[PDB]
Design a protein around this ligand. Structure first.
Ligand SMILES: Cc1ncc(C[n+]2csc(CCOP(=O)(O)OP(=O)(O)O)c2C)c(N)n1
Ligand SMILES: Cc1ncc(C[n+]2csc(CCOP(=O)(O)OP(=O)(O)O)c2C)c(N)n1
Ligand SMILES: CCOP(=O)(O)C(=O)CCC(=O)O
Ligand SMILES: CCOP(=O)(O)C(=O)CCC(=O)O
Ligand SMILES: [Ca+2]
Ligand SMILES: [Ca+2]
Ligand SMILES: [Mg+2]
Ligand SMILES: [Mg+2]
Lengths: 814, 815
């Protein structure tokens, strides 16, 4: 008998959520449909079976379905158990009237939006208004914990309602010259109704691509947390900036970026101390039923991936919705982990203007047609329970009518009316930092020569690409800049070239040489910091996060590195929807850097190209900077210009692979100490040597590592009749610098654009069309030397690659 | 009190026993790890109850199943794991050893013979070979038809040799491309009398991107064998066997998207067997930087799949778990995940000393001896084999090592390498009548009834709109015996409420598919055709991957995927770049998949305007894809029929309309379907059928899409006989000959303009502006552009700015 009780308690805790009254439509009729003497007997604390069962039914089988026994941490399971398995105190009349007022403001907003304007049906929150008192309870509970800010990400459903009743934006600002408003960012201040605290509330900008903003929100919050010295990279572990992420039920289950973003939740380089997720689960996705949208019982089942607690709540019970919201914030504060709230509701109207939803879902919409909304239901529930009188119920209808009148009246009144060069001592300091090892630290025998070579390069020259990058980042940290660098195996570097973090051979303790530059020689801090991480095996969420991080902190130097540029197409939605276009669409600025290893080396179509042609196609004046530097010093100056120009614009860099170790691809100390970024580069024989520009009859225009191969052939045959000019900055085209350079070669009879990439790829599709237009006196008659047009970035054979590479060089000097 | 503690102890082992199981062959985490003779209620002693629990849940197998919501599935697993298992026979143990011998010999050979083969090494993970063998042998025991494998490149040539059964002469012929190619073979049971087909699908370097492609390929083969969801039997006799790495399984979103398809009526394959080669590393990255969960397989809890964590140094437990996984898949038609914990013996690649970034792990790996030597030693200790049998096993390894060196040596010396689309009027009338041939007692929605009546009207009288022309093309192909699979977001009804391929009973919710009536001939016999139309999940990457895979699985099928708006297809960029546009040239893998991308400047913003024509034209190379933007319903009909009947496997990219679906000028006559063909270049009807004079034309406007109707309306309003509008219907391959012949009919043309709605850096202009003056210098030298200004987004966010820009384009064209 005692064993049956223990099995019954476990059954309610594990599967009680399957029997809970969570659906306000009660569509599934089989949900509930599919000894007595022992009830008065006491069982081991000592309690009667009737009391054990009543607590279990109220906690797990009422309007809240709790999923938590999947959580591997026993202390988290106990925390939930203790707060859910108790006789809860009824809310005060003032708290109930406050919830009803939020519902009044929410429904008053929806009734206005549909009546006043045309084409607003797709943004309707009708049937889901209970999300407003729920979000209000989340933010109020965050203010109760004394937190600094709540940052919201959401799709467009009920967005202007969120702006008005959550962010607190006035109607004059919302409906000012009223489309793009459903995708813009916003900021406001939330003031507690019954408390004495206030909290900042912001909304991030987003495209129509559902869930794509999810990792952008995480990076944005993480950037704000690092600035406030809270969380993982802060003195306190309060994570005082809270991500509040809203979702639709079909999008939460079908979009892969959801799983990728959940996967970042506890990572040292990406954690935000837990996200509060709210799914507006209207049990439909346009015309699609949940059975065609997901292969699981709940739309939130993906969140079990990180052992997050899940709360399924009845959208027609705003008291349960507000209580679950406050419990979610308390769980997040206690364990610094994600909490998911599944709000079961409905979509009152069609998906859009041309939709009669009974065409595709007749059963659901015959049931929806009998529904009266949460505001009217909750008013009737408070009357029946005896919580409010008829006068209080009438004053609530008067509150609703007044909120409806105020928005119509306020909208009516609105309708009536810099050097990048550093000193030699700076290079030497960064060099010395690589040998300034902590006491008792054991360097790996293969890492030690890299550290010694860096000190050698800093004092004697012949600086390679990898060190030049760290010289740029190190000098920025010394000047007080925050530098965040991440990507797949980025601490060591894919080509074993970076060693930004070195690992103790005996203890595994990490040492970051560039972090020593965050302290001045006098011992005071510079204000700078180096945050370098190995990313998860993700492109979409990682690129999204880094973009979001640069929005959250515009003063930060943010760099994301692809393993190979070929894998950045996994993040195409972030590149297309945020990086390349965010400024023009929403006035949202980003200084994010994308490092894309690129080059034809015979390693196949997925280890050759970062697709230069695609980034050049996306580019428009002032949207991005696109570069492919050929020297370590020019890359150093490119990174320093980017971090110090005071302009928030993304930078796309096509970085080297074998050229990292090319002995000809090295720079002198003077290139770092007495120079600047050069958008156009000439051969050193004309600028520093004894070369004669007047002997040149053939001009080769190129970019990247193929320069060294072209220069080697020129030197081998003593070809004084041929000159090689490098275009370092691909976008914006350096028109003036290119014109001035070409004017120094007056006897040129033919010009050729030389590239490794196929004819339909690289810089030729854009340069071949733009150069004869922007500079007709210089590029009329410009011809192409490249690989043949291909459906892939390269051949799969290293043998075919070698033949094609030699064919390019022979054509250029033929 | 004592009896209650036993019940709580049983639950604890079932729920959390996997956290205490000896699953790591490296044992890196050191913190991981009188009532006995008393009988408890069947009646058994506590020592016997605890021994069953420890052996089942805390030995070399970690079982996760109490998260499964189905009680019958929890019960099935419980009953098979909580029993005194019969020890395998000496012959079965020897067979597992022979597979370890063959796998290890292969790996020693690859690293001694060739250069640059370190990154593909299966050393420390060789137990995946007897595990995969057990999966396929168990599938053959169930009398199944085929196992289709998808995997990354680690151990791929080893899989080809010891799983697929390819010979060394075929594997090492002209020996990196082989690490991505597809393969086919036959598996013959060692102890059984059954055989089963085994295939390997082609894939790019993009980890996990092949996952929905495999599901698609399997589903197409299942449909062909009349097995599964669209079959007569519930066997789902084609089994997907999907291999993964631990870092990629946790980090790539396409994994969750593909798991989300597992039980969907349009996408289910009756369960996938997943094998994660969990070497507890991702290049230089430790699992703590790769995932926010206890296990790399925790994403699979999303669909309530059972998960088995198994010690890679115990090949008996690995083989047993593999067979149990196949039995679970056969019983419940749902995914099973096997997490094989192992290690990576060598560096990730040639330039890696793995002790630089993971010194603790590789000091422990340096003391490891491999699963082959370990299992041989384990069989001696247990007394299962003798020293003579152990020496015979070592001789078997040597024999296998010699054979691969000899066969490749023998190879090196021998080898020297180091149609009309028009239908009859009766076909049109039949498709029209099918829309009104409703089942008995069916109640049509009052707003759907006029659409069905209008389709019968169009079929007999003409003025056929875009939406009906599409169904006329698909319907006629089904009548000719072709399988037609159409899917995408809200594709049954259509995003713009225009398709109604499936209609729903107003009173019962019963679905009716009018085009399915064309799968039966007028005499009552089947045509061999079928219409498979589905609403997809809210995915682009997995759904596009699936449809590409489906066309590979069945080359005779007509496969169409429809984007809600073309603007969202960039969510599937990896599939477009790595499979659709390039699969043929890279691997010789052909696909006839169709992508339908709603496109057009209508003032609905930058995410409801463009399918990015410029990106598809940039990806295109001769013979890779067909790219079209039809302007008329009849030309779209002929485009789809040419595509399905040309006998060529090549992807088709179609930029489809939105408001042009209801443009009353964008309709076609019956004769356009019955006495015509696809026209890559279209002239104005006034010159081909009317009284228009081509000799009066001095200005030629070249265009594509719906803007034609706006240009034609302005020409008619101002009676501009001096201006002609020529449409390029087929954007790629450029119809050079038809374009040249068309332009030659206008001898008094002094200026030519390419007119487009898209910004200057978008649409067809970036490629056409560079290609047309090169391929046709006598016709397009001096060709000028009329378009929107170059933009960082596909359009402005304002419908007001859109309207001003649209009018500006028309005024420039006639200015
Ligand atoms: C990535 C992406 N694919 C497709 C669309 C088109 N789309 C807009 S609304 C919708 C359905 C959304 O369903 P759900 O997530 O349940 O949200 P609801 O509209 O029901 O609030 C779709 C597919 C989109 N905006 N983003
Ligand atoms: C989508 C993608 N991003 C990046 C890479 C580069 N890459 C190749 S191997 C590797 C690590 C794979 O780790 P895991 O999944 O554990 O497999 P393992 O190599 O350990 O077998 C990475 C990131 C890739 N091939 N695909
Ligand atoms: C018609 C189906 O798509 P829509 O609802 O337009 C859609 O993409 C909603 C999301 C948005 O536009 O912000
Ligand atoms: C250096 C890390 O990347 P690689 O291992 O080259 C890689 O992409 C492995 C997957 C493949 O190439 O098939
Ligand atoms: Ca900048
Ligand atoms: Ca074809
Ligand atoms: Mg929904
Ligand atoms: Mg691995």
């Amino acid at each position: 008998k005692n064993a049956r009780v223990i099995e019954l308690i476990a059954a309610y805790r594990n599967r009680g959520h399957l029997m809970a009254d969570i659906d306000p439509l009660r569509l599934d009729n089989t949900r509930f449909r599919s000894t007595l003497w022992d009830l008065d007997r006491e069982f081991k604390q000592r309690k009667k079976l009737r009391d054990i069962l009543s607590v279990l039914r109220d906690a797990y089988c009422r309007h809240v379905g709790v999923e938590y026994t999947h959580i591997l941490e026993p202390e988290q399971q106990r925390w939930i158990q203790e707060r859910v398995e108790t006789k809860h105190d009824k809310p005060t009349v003032a708290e109930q009237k406050y919830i009803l007022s939020k519902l009044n403001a929410a429904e008053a907003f929806e009734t206005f939006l549909q009546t006043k304007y045309v084409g607003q049906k797709r943004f309707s929150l009708e049937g889901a208004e209970t999300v407003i008192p729920m979000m209000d309870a989340v933010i109020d509970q965050c203010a109760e914990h004394g937190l600094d800010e709540v940052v919201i990400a959401m799709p467009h459903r009920g967005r202007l309602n969120v702006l008005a009743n959550i962010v607190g934006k006035p109607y004059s600002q919302i409906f000012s010259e009223f489309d793009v408003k459903y995708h813009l960012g916003a900021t406001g201040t939330y003031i507690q109704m019954f408390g004495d605290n206030d909290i900042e509330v912001s909304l991030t900008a987003n495209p129509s691509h559902l869930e794509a903003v999810d990792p952008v929100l995480e990076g944005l919050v993480r950037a704000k947390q690092d600035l406030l010295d809270t969380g993982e990279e802060g003195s306190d572990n309060r994570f005082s900036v809270v991500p509040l992420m809203l979702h639709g039920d079909a999008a939460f289950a079908g979009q892969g970026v959801v799983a990728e973003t959940l996967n970042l939740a506890l990572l040292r380089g990406y954690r935000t101390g837990g996200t509060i997720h709210i799914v507006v689960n209207n049990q439909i996705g346009f015309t699609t039923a949940p059975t065609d949208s997901r292969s699981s019982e709940y739309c939130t089942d993906v969140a079990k991936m990180i052992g997050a607690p899940i709360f399924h709540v009845n959208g027609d019970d705003p008291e349960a919705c507000a209580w679950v919201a406050r419990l979610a914030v308390d769980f997040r504060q206690a364990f610094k982990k994600d909490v998911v709230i599944d709000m079961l509701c409905y979509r009152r109207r069609g998906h859009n203007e041309g939709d009669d939803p009974s065409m595709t879902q007749p059963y659901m919409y015959d049931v929806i047609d009998t529904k009266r909304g949460s505001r009217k239901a909750y008013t009737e529930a408070l009357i029946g329970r005896g919580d409010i009188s008829m006068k209080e119920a009438e004053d609530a209808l008067r509150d609703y009518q007044g909120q409806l009148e105020r928005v119509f009246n306020e909208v009516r009144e609105l309708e009536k009316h810099l050097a990048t060069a550093v000193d030699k001592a700076m290079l030497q300091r960064i060099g010395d930092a690589h040998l300034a090892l902590p006491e008792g630290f054991t360097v790996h025998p293969r890492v030690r020569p890299v550290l010694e070579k860096r000190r050698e390069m800093a004092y004697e020259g012949r600086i390679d690409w990898a060190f030049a990058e760290l010289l740029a980042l190190g000098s920025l940290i010394a000047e007080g800049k925050l530098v965040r660098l991440s990507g797949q195996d980025t601490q060591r570097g894919t080509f074993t070239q970076r060693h930004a973090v070195i690992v103790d051979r005996k203890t595994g303790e990490e040492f970051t040489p560039l972090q020593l530059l965050a302290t001045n020689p006098d011992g005071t801090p510079t204000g700078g910091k180096f945050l370098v991480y190995n990313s998860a095996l993700s492109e979409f969420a990682a690129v999204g996060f880094e973009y979001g991080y640069s929005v959250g902190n515009p003063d930060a130097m943010v760099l994301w590195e692809a393993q190979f540029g070929d894998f950045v197409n996994g993040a195409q939605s972030i590149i297309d929807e945020f990086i390349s276009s965010g400024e023009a669409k929403w006035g949202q600025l980003s200084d994010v850097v994308l490092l894309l290893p690129h080059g034809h080396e015979g390693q196949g179509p997925d280890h050759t190209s970062g697709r230069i042609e695609r980034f050049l196609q996306l580019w428009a004046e002032g949207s991005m900077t696109i570069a492919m530097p050929s020297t370590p010093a020019n890359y150093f100056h490119l990174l320093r210009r980017h971090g110090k120009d005071g302009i928030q614009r993304p930078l796309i860099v096509f970085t080297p692979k074998s050229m990292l170790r090319n002995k000809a691809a090295v720079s002198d100390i003077r290139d770092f100490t007495e120079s600047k970024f050069r958008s156009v580069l000439e051969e050193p024989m004309y600028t520093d040597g004894e070369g004669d520009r007047n002997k040149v009859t053939r001009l080769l225009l190129t970019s990247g590592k193929i320069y060294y191969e072209l220069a080697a052939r020129k030197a081998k045959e003593n070809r004084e009749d041929v000159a090689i000019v490098r275009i370092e900055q691909l976008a914006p085209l350096p028109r003036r610098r290119l014109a001035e350079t070409l004017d120094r070669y007056p006897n040129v009879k033919e010009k050729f654009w030389v590239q490794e990439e196929p004819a339909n790829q690289g810089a030729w599709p854009s340069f071949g069309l733009t150069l004869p237009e922007i500079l007709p006196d210089h590029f009329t008659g410009l011809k192409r030397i490249s690989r043949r047009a291909m459906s892939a970035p390269s051949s799969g054979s290293s043998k075919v690659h070698a033949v094609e590479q030699q064919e390019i060089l022979d054509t250029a000097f033929g």
